[PDB]
């Protein structure tokens, strides 16, 4: 129904035709420019018989076919014009010698050129173009019309056509449509009566007074009707007192309202777009690919190092590639030469501050291998968002996690690590590593634990306890990665943003919170904080014990509904003495104030 435009010029044998064909059949509205350049004399042109509208310009240059039949072409919009001047550009459509020349331009239904002019020159055997009243078609009075220097030995125009025709036939006549209308219409009329103007949604002329009578839509087309906007995605339901998805929803693809975007198009906001913006991500909703805000930063996947890669370790030339990376396709290797520099390959030492680039990493598909770490960095808090180590690819003797000979590390600091899907674990020769002794690897390491742990020769458990380096009281029997309530494997009571807490803000505190599977989530804003009582039982405006501002149905709202469009018109409400939102009078136009008719607007 709707196809894209080509954007080339006179720039270009068999492929070119293939590209043209697949592109324009079976489309009706060209979102761009219709460019027909260098086409053979016996090429099938029936795939262009359904084109009704072209939003850009029409370029017909150096073709060899005898006739160009566009019987359904009604409107050339001219949003993009050729050489800044022409909506229609026809030039050089004839063969080197041979009788393979274009003789007829069949635009029998061409009614309107909204912007741009017409250029028809140097077509040796093209006739009848000098008889057409182009001013009847071209809306803009300032546009240039240049039709000259074409066919010289041309047949007279048929007597039925009255001197104006697209061809020599009796059905090839041009039908004049420009009429004289009254002042009330701003140049948009279908008759001379002041009550015979075109609809306000008509771009130019029209066949009648209705939505459905335009030659071209001023904004959008909805299944035959020219509309200011496509049907809204959301609609206020009077019975559920909130915005519900509209069944009649259509999205913006150019100037047409469509129920679903094409194959390679996503829905952002109200419109079909080529790709999703950097601030939003692609998600499947009700059958369609929609764009929704990432809630922070968007997922990004980077290639790793080690096994199956070009880098054996991350270094000065690699570290910059992991910016804003959440998932790592492969492994991470931290070797001695990578951290301190490689003289053989002339790679400088790594800047410790650049290691903070891994703070966005949530998952490592392969293994994690740390054999070298900066002296002043006594932990791996750089990997504090790391949740999963896949172990899909292993290191050495089947290791997925390997912390070796890091004599300055005091605690692990993997406070988000919850799963190591496969592989063995090797943590040794870290002489000052404490906290790891009490950790239950069964909860983290997936599968049978037996013989998959190789943890020894670290700081002895006796020295750690005597120095006070033990787990926080709020930690469960699972253990911890370091000191504090935010370093626990699991909490005894509740957790608030990765930090173990004794209780949520149930009865006091800002913001107020509710419990959900031993986790603290805040109440909806607009819940009035209750003194000595629970504020909410869950998230949402309908789970509040009392509304801060107003109440609409079961929900709490900041502002009473002041013109929210529903199924059959806008919906207005007012806040009564009990701050609850009540409907307005049925005969009110814009405002409310109160329930009575006298309070309107």
């Amino acid at each position: 129904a709707v196809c894209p435009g080509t954007l080339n010029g006179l720039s270009v044998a068999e492929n070119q035709y293939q590209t043209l064909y697949k592109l324009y059949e079976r489309c009706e509205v060209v979102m761009g420019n219709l460019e027909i350049v260098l086409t053979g004399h016996n090429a099938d042109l029936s795939f262009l018989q359904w084109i009704r509208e072209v939003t850009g310009y029409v370029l017909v240059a150096m073709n060899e076919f005898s006739t160009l039949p566009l019987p359904n072409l009604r409107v050339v919009r001219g949003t993009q014009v050729y050489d800044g001047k022409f909506a229609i550009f026809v030039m050089l459509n004839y063969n080197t010698n041979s009788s393979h020349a274009l003789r007829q331009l069949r635009l029998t239904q061409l009614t309107e050129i909204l912007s741009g002019g017409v250029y028809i020159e140097k077509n040796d055997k093209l006739c009848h173009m000098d008889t057409i009243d182009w001013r009847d078609i071209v809306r803009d009075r300032d546009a240039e019309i240049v039709v000259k220097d074409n066919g010289r030995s041309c047949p007279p125009c048929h007597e039925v056509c009255k001197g104006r025709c697209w061809g020599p036939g009796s059905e090839d006549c041009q039908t004049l449509t420009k009429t004289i209308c009254a002042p009330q219409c701003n140049g948009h009329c279908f008759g001379p009566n002041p009550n015979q103007c075109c609809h306000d949604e008509c771009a130019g002329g029209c066949s009648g007074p209705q939505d459905t009578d335009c030659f071209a839509c001023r904004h959008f087309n909805d299944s035959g009707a020219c509309v200011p906007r496509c049907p809204q995605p959301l609609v206020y339901n009077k019975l559920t007192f909130q915005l519900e998805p509209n069944p009649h929803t259509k999205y913006q693809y150019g100037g047409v309202c469509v129920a679903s975007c094409p194959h390679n198009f996503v829905v952002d906001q109200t419109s079909c777009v080529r790709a999703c913006p950097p601030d939003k991500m692609e998600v499947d909703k009700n059958g369609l690919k929609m764009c929704e805000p990432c809630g922070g930063l968007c997922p990004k996947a980077c290639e790793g190092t080690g096994s199956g890669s070009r880098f054996q370790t991350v270094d000065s030339s690699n570290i910059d590639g992991f910016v804003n990376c959440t998932k790592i396709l492969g492994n991470l290797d931290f070797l001695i030469t990578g951290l301190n520099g490689d003289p053989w390959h002339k790679i400088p030492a790594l800047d410790p501050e650049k290691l903070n680039v891994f703070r966005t990493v949530r998952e490592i598909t392969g293994y994690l291998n740390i054999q070298s770490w900066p002296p002043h960095m006594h932990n791996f808090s750089v990997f504090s968002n790391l949740t999963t180590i896949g172990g899909r690819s292993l290191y050495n003797r089947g290791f997925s996690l390997l912390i070796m000979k890091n004599l300055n590390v005091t605690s692990l600091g993997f406070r988000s690590l919850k799963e190591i899907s496969a592989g063995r674990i090797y943590i040794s020769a870290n002489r000052q590593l404490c906290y790891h002794h009490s950790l239950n690897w069964t909860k983290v390491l997936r599968g049978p634990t037996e013989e998959r742990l190789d943890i020894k020769h670290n700081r002895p458990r006796r020295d750690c306890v005597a120095e006070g380096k033990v787990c926080d009281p709020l930690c469960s029997s699972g253990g911890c990665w370091g000191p504090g309530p935010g370093q626990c494997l699991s909490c005894r009571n509740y957790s608030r943003g990765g930090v173990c807490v004794t209780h949520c803000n149930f009865l006091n505190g800002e913001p107020r919170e509710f419990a959900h599977e031993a986790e603290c989530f805040s109440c909806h804003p607009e819940c009035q904080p209750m003194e000595g009582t629970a504020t909410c039982n869950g998230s949402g405006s309908d789970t509040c014990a009392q509304c801060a501002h107003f109440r609409d149905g079961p929900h709490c709202v900041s502002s009473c509904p002041h013109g929210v469009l529903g199924a059959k018109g806008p919906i207005y409400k007012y806040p009564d003495v009990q701050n609850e939102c009540r409907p307005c009078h049925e005969n009110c136009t814009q405002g409310c104030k109160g329930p009575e008719l006298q309070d309107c607007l």
Partner: antibody
């Protein structure tokens, strides 16, 4: 900059044929029209025809009665013109010129010209 | 075919004075579609190829001095030189920019009035 160098002088007997070259440089040769104009000694200018270098589509003057044929070589950026069945009157200086653009046939860049003299 | 007639055939103008050359075409050259006159003026000194001065009746080519000027419409056109210089002596040609066969005028020599 933009240059158009034509071939040397030619001397032919009545009934023979001439092929004159015109090598272009200094601009994109493909997107241009090349026109040919002749001028008899002491007489005025006369348009013979033009040709689009990109495809090779020409347009000749009917008064030459089908004796003129124009060609373009994209590889050498050279235009060629050919006159068949030569006459005494076809003794002229034959000029090779370029149209300024698509919208004007006016000849802005000319060649130095070649003298084609036809006599027995 | 269109016919271009230039008047006079030869013109003698003193140095620094003003020179006008007329051109009359058999058919109109004005295009109602854009109100543009497709008329071209050339200058040819003896021994060298012609030089383009003015196209579209009144528009000068890049490099052409301000003293050269074109006017007229439809079938009557005029080429004026406000102050004739010593390098301005040559034969001047009229040409149709409209269509086939782009006919040249018969030409007019301009000499210094001595």
């Amino acid at each position: 900059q933009v240059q158009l160098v034509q071939s040397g002088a030619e001397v032919k007997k009545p009934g023979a044929s001439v092929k004159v070259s015109c090598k272009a440089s200094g601009y994109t040769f493909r997107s241009s029209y090349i026109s040919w104009v002749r001028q008899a000694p002491g007489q005025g200018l006369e348009w013979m025809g033009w040709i689009y270098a990109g495809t090779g589509s020409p347009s000749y003057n009917q008064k030459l009665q089908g004796r003129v044929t124009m060609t373009t070589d994209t590889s050498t950026s050279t235009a060629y013109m050919e006159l068949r069945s030569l006459r005494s009157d076809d003794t002229a200086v034959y000029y090779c010129a370029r149209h300024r653009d698509y919208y004007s046939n006016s000849l802005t860049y000319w060649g130095q010209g070649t003298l084609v003299t036809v006599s027995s | 075919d269109i016919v271009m007639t230039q008047s006079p055939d030869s013109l003698a103008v003193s140095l620094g004075e003003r020179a006008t050359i007329n051109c009359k075409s058999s058919q109109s050259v004005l295009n109602s579609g854009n109100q543009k006159n497709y008329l071209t003026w050339y200058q040819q000194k003896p021994g060298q190829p012609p030089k383009l001065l003015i196209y579209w009746a009144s528009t000068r080519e890049s490099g052409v001095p301000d003293r050269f000027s074109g006017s007229g419409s439809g079938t009557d056109f005029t080429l004026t030189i406000s102050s004739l210089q010593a390098e301005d002596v040559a034969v001047y040609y009229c040409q149709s920019d409209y269509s086939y066969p782009y006919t040249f005028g018969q030409g007019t020599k301009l000499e210094i009035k001595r």
